[PDB]
Write a protein that binds this DNA or RNA. Structure first.
Ligand SMILES: O=P(O)(O)O[C@H]1[C@H](OP(=O)(O)O)[C@@H](OP(=O)(O)O)[C@H](OP(=O)(O)O)[C@@H](OP(=O)(O)O)[C@H]1OP(=O)(O)O
Lengths: 141, 27, 137, 96, 100
RNA sequence: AAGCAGCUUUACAGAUCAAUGGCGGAGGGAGGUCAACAUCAAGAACUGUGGGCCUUUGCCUAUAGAACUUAUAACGAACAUGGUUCUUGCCUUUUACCAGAAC
């Protein structure tokens, strides 16, 4: 009932046994679960950084995907006497909205936009607090 | 952040590519 | 006494939610729950001027439900029938070793914009800054 | 291979204890550039030698929080995988 | 005009907690904090202009964007009342200090 | 959700011990670090079956069955090497190499 057989191909466990393995595996599986943690720090944002030759802080760097930028048209369009400087476009913006904040983006993938702000309440200290209980972090109604 | 400053790589360059903001630059 | 003290918090929370109260006192009752989530970092500053052993711990176990005898009769008048080795340093190696560090910052720089950046990077103390302008000149 | 196999022989002879066995297996896998000359003959294995050194920097800092310095970290499962994956590509080439 | 990357800055500085929404159904307008005819106001080239030179900057950059004003490298041709009336009545206007 | 009747079986005593009707059975059941074969990336995507058009491929319409693998895309919640061809790095040449791309 726990595994299929001696060939050892499938397993099937129970809830007090899965809790006990989950409690034992705390020092290696301790991690930040909610998906908003990885905002601008997931695969596609690393792909967009690689493809735009822009560097997220903490993220890896690569060779330029399109190394030839020496070609240049001397046009009046992006002339600074036309441009209003009000907010510096820092490089996190180029990854978060890649078709807006880049001129000429190539080999770029569309990022995931948002996740609902997570309200999960759990405690680690006292096991004897009940499953349904008012959190000291909650607004009192 | 990268902010449009720096080499494209420190591969043909003979340098490490380390960039720092200047403190003598007033703004 | 966190178990009993939560139950006081548990009982007090019943009042704000399911009971009508006065207006001006109401924002005082919910302010007490606003500090619970900010965790009391504005109510714990004071004069703990005894060590946790230098104060001999006389935690008196009183209650407000017992008699306390009211001995006001003492405040009236009554009638008693009763080894560091202080080496003076004349070498001044310290001021020589700091002069070499500044002279070398200057001589390793292409421009004076890049020489000032390296001096500003060292973060020299306030009392040494007059000594730095003197080396530059 | 003879290096790893003989680390298990010392334990099975009773010369070292279980904690020393794990520390030695974890030491070999992070020091294959120091212990064998494998990079002299196929130099691209310096990718694997530098990835085991990167994993050792991140493991030693988890393991030694509120501990000191000195040996005794035998968590060899991440660097074992790196060498097992290197073998995956070296089998077809050496076979030819 | 100050909103470019407002969402990204909030969503990073509060670690995925926190979220922003921006909308314009109420159609609030507000005066730009400078004076739209002001020659002496300093506009730096690569840095954002200070708050008193701010109305004069937005007028000039849109006049060069649309075409309207032309100059050597950075044009200085304001929207001025004298081009419509005359120089003659504008001489009396400049006399009383009415139009600078 | 109890009892009663009907329904289905059930351990069954049976009317028949014929011809029948139903559910099972024609290779018991669970397993194996056993093996052979088939199959696993594409109009969001599948075969078969019946009719019609054309005279079976095709097409249109009716209908049965679709196991596994895929949407922050895929047999693997994992993750290595080689070849060719560009573009680079280091550079006395070849190997061994640097690091990006396409196949
Ligand atoms: O060079 P250090 O700054 O002194 O760092 C050393 C070094 O690690 P790396 O050179 O790989 O960063 C030692 O490794 P080796 O010198 O043996 O290559 C390592 O010791 P072991 O790898 O032999 O365990 C030791 O770690 P520790 O002293 O905890 O054993 C570690 O020091 P840090 O832990 O301070 O990085």
């Amino acid at each position: 009932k726990k595994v299929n057989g001696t060939s050892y191909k499938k397993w099937s466990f129970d809830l007090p046994e899965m809790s006990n393995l989950y409690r034992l595996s705390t020092p290696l599986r301790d991690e930040v679960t909610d998906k908003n943690y990885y905002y601008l720090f997931d695969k596609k944002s690393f792909f967009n950084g690689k493809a735009l030759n822009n560097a997220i802080p903490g993220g890896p760097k690569f060779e330029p995907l399109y190394p030839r930028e020496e070609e240049e048209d001397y046009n009046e369009f992006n002339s600074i006497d036309r441009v209003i400087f009000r907010v510096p476009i820092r490089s996190e913006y180029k990854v978060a909205f890649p078709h807006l904040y880049n001129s000429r983006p190539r080999s770029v993938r569309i990022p995931w936009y948002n996740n609902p702000v997570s309200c999960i309440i759990q405690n680690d200290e006292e096991y004897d607090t009940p499953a349904l209980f008012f959190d000291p972090s909650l607004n009192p109604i | 952040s990268y902010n449009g400053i720096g080499l494209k790589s420190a591969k043909g360059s003979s340098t490490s590519g380390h960039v720092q903001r200047s403190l003598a630059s007033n703004n | 006494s966190k178990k009993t003290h939560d139950m006081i918090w548990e009982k007090l929370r019943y009042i704000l939610q399911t009971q009508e109260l006065s207006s001006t006192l109401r924002e005082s009752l919910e302010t007490l729950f606003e500090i619970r989530q900010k965790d009391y970092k504005s109510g714990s500053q004071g004069l703990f001027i005894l060590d946790p052993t230098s104060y001999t711990v006389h935690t008196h176990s009183y209650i407000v439900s017992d008699e306390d005898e009211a001995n006001k009769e003492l405040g009236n008048f009554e009638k008693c029938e009763n080894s560091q080795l202080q080496i003076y340093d004349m070498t001044s190696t310290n001021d020589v070793e700091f002069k070499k560090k500044i002279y070398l910052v200057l001589k390793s720089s292409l421009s004076g914009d890049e020489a000032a950046h390296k001096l500003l990077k060292l973060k020299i103390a306030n009392n040494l800054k007059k000594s730095v302008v003197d080396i530059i000149i | 291979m003879k290096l790893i196999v003989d680390t298990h022989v010392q334990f099975r002879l009773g010369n070292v204890d279980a904690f020393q066995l794990a520390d030695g297996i974890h030491y070999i896998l992070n020091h294959i550039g120091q212990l064998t000359g494998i990079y002299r003959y196929k130099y691209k294995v310096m990718h694997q030698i530098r990835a085991c050194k990167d994993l050792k920097h991140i493991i030693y800092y988890k393991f030694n929080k509120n501990l000191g310095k000195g040996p005794g970290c035998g968590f060899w499962q991440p660097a074992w995988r790196v060498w097992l994956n290197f073998l995956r590509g070296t089998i077809p080439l050496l076979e030819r | 005009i100050e909103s470019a990357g407002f969402e990204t800055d909030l969503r990073l500085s509060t670690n995925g907690l926190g979220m922003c929404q921006l909308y314009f159904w109420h159609k609030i307008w507000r005066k730009v904090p400078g004076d739209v005819l002001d020659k002496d106001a300093f506009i730096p080239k690569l840095k954002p202009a200070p708050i008193n030179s701010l109305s004069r900057d937005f007028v000039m950059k849109t006049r060069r964007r649309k075409g309207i004003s032309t100059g050597g490298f950075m044009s200085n041709d304001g929207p001025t009342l004298e081009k419509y009336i005359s120089a003659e009545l504008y001489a009396q206007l400049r006399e009383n200090g009415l139009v600078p």
